[PDB]
Design a protein around this ligand. Structure first.
Ligand SMILES: Nc1ncnc2c1ncn2[C@@H]1O[C@H](COP(=O)(O)OP(=O)(O)O)[C@@H](O)[C@H]1O
Ligand SMILES: Nc1ncnc2c1ncn2[C@@H]1O[C@H](COP(=O)(O)OP(=O)(O)O)[C@@H](O)[C@H]1O
Ligand SMILES: OC[C@H]1O[C@](O)(CO)[C@@H](O)[C@@H]1O
Ligand SMILES: OC[C@H]1O[C@](O)(CO)[C@@H](O)[C@@H]1O
Ligand SMILES: [Ca+2]
Ligand SMILES: [Ca+2]
Ligand SMILES: [K+]
Ligand SMILES: [K+]
Lengths: 310, 310
């Protein structure tokens, strides 16, 4: 027959990450979780497309140029006439949520409109993170996009990727995020995120707490220990090569990029061997992404990833 | 008798200027026009104090640490619980307003409150720029501070320092700025600013247009040609050494710093010889400030300034 490379849509925040380098200097690094995933998929020769809003400013034009250079489809990237592109300062002493300071609140992406959503098609993927749910109108626009992708027979990937300070009403984060968890085909958590969102003290408890959601695939990253893969009535650990991280920025998005790339090119992404293989790629991408400063810098192509996987 | 070094109060925006340096890098430079003037006065061994608002964030704490290191009194620098410190990207191909992109709108300084204003005393100075007038509540708070300084028998310095993009209602800029021009003892313009604000095509026309304001001292900077000094029924050019600029960022604030330092230590700042001498210092400071990247970096001490003046 013929191969079927499905398009992956990414939406949310494209951001400039200011990363200390020699510091009284910052590296000007392209970033923003869904932009990172888009570039990760494209670098692996996948088919990714971004829709959303950046600012009509140099940082916004920098992110548009970056995504375009990386062969990400940006036909549906919009430039807001008023609001500025997200600008984030990174603390290299931390990893994850604790490492980021958001200087632009609310940034242009928070003003995502219904009209920004492109036509979706059966079999396509949509990936979203929680910053897209942080404030209106992006929150309601993003939930509408999710419902539309489900309706047309596409698939939904959700990575909470929690950044509480972005929420003008942080008391709304837990419920809003769990509503999106309830819409997804694929959900990726860090260990801490799963426990926080479900109010549990163990991964096992956390998984039992969302069993009612009947999620096809839940993946819980375990840092160096790889990832727990949860499918209906089944859990297993998939572990890869451990590396000493130089810059953890973007590791989780790289992980999601490898995962979604392999799901997107699969005959049937629900196939258990397909999923386990996709997580092996995800682990490899996550490790490699830490080897250079910047979320996107070390996102691997297939030659590099295969060489690393052995 | 005894010398009388008057305190100069500065209020408005303290900002982090991101200046290309090796660029895919930015230099992280302390800045913001009234913060620049405060540091310029302190470096010349004057008595400067800052009141206003920065964000409760690393950039805000960086500016507090900077002003403190520079011996600027920061007892009245406040940290806003919600809004972020102003962050500005600099274009080295431009000078003045055209070189700055404001990423944080509205930044913490725009939320200056009546309670942020310190007690003023007779003979003290207050210096303000137009960003403090850009939006509420800072606009009304700053006009209140101005009226209070006038009432107690202090002096008011105003440097429009126009940055239109900071105004949520830019159609209000001209009238709002000219209202402040009408309150000042000392006003400093660039040539372009004077003509723009008065809607005239020459400096001479611009000066005639504000004659009705009965301003004690108007200074119009002329780039390398020095400055025009306008006092009642009198104008003269004061020119100093021309330098080849390396980074024009902060030149105008350095100029104001030298000017206000010498006015602040004078027996009678209205004295014409005093004023002309103060402008000679101002010119020297303006030139020296261009010799390094960053608004504050090359603000001179007296040893450097005297050596440059000859
Ligand atoms: N030292 C490390 N060695 C190998 N892989 C790592 C390492 N750190 C992170 N990763 C990889 O990248 C993924 C992301 O790691 P993680 O710390 O859980 O990021 P996040 O909390 O954002 O999900 C891991 O699942 C793992 O596959
Ligand atoms: N090439 C230059 N050579 C000497 N002095 C300069 C030079 N450029 C700027 N200055 C000094 O610094 C001041 C500020 O210059 P200017 O270009 O008018 O800045 P601004 O437009 O912000 O007021 C000048 O009045 C002048 O005294
Ligand atoms: O996941 C890493 C990414 O997440 C963010 O914090 C927000 O989207 C970015 O600053 C960073 O590149
Ligand atoms: O006058 C120079 C200063 O003016 C600003 O643009 C705003 O206050 C700063 O970015 C800069 O340091
Ligand atoms: Ca993450
Ligand atoms: Ca100026
Ligand atoms: K990295
Ligand atoms: K400079």
């Amino acid at each position: 027959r013929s191969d079927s490379m499905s398009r992956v849509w990414l939406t949310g925040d494209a951001v400039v990450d200011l990363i200390p380098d020699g510091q009284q200097h910052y590296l000007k690094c392209p970033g923003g979780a869904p932009a990172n995933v888009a570039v990760a998929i494209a670098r692996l020769s996948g088919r990714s497309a971004f829709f959303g809003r950046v600012g009509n400013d140099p940082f916004g034009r920098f992110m548009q140029q970056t995504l375009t250079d990386e062969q990400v489809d940006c036909q549906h990237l919009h430039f807001d006439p008023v609001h500025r592109t997200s600008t984030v300062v990174v603390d290299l002493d931390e990893c994850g949520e604790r490492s980021f300071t958001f200087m632009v609140k609310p940034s242009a992406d928070q003003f995502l409109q219904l009209s920004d959503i492109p036509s979706f098609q059966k079999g396509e993927w949509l990936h979203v993170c929680s910053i897209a749910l942080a404030n209106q109108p992006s929150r309601s626009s993003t939930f509408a996009a999710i419902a539309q992708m489900k309706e047309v027979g596409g698939y939904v990937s959700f990575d909470p990727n929690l950044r509480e300070e972005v929420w003008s009403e942080p008391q709304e984060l837990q419920a809003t995020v769990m509503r999106a968890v309830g819409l997804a085909d694929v959900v990726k958590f860090s260990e801490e995120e799963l426990q926080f969102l479900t109010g549990t003290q163990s991964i096992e408890e956390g998984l039992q707490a969302i069993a009612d959601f009947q999620i096809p695939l839940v993946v819980v990253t375990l840092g160096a220990k790889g990832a727990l893969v949860a499918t209906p009535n089944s859990q297993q650990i998939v572990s890869g090569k451990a590396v000493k991280p130089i810059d953890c920025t973007g590791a989780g998005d790289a992980f999601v990029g490898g995962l979604l790339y392999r799901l997107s090119v699969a005959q049937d992404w629900h196939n258990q061997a397909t999923i386990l293989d996709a997580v092996k790629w995800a682990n490899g991408c996550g490790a490699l992404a830490t080897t250079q400063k910047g979320a996107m810098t070390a996102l691997p192509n297939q030659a590099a990833l295969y060489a690393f996987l052995e």
